[PDB]
Design a protein around this ligand. Sequence first.
Ligand SMILES: [Zn+2]
Length: 120
Amino acid sequence: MTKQEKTALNMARFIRSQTLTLLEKLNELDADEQADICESLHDHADELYRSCLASFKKNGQIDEQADICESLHDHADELYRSCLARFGGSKQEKTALNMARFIRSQTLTLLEKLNELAKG
Ligand SMILES: [Zn+2]
């Protein structure tokens, strides 16, 4: 596996955990809709990672992974969007929001590094 691939792999796994850490915080606020969205988000992160391991162990010939990540970014964005439309203004809520945004960003750059990888 190359440094490129590894970084991209190391970014995917990181997202699998973050979706879990934020899922926790989301449950405490009883933000049921958001918690539900984060789940699909987490489920997409599980498929994306697995798919990348498969490729990076054979050959970094990624293609579907890029497609997935796109769907992962959509959720991370949707998640952020919904949180930005229903949260009050407390500390607890402030954190769950910035983490949501943080994820959105991490999924953006992931998608980038994956695309720059599908073109060789
Ligand atoms: Zn999972």
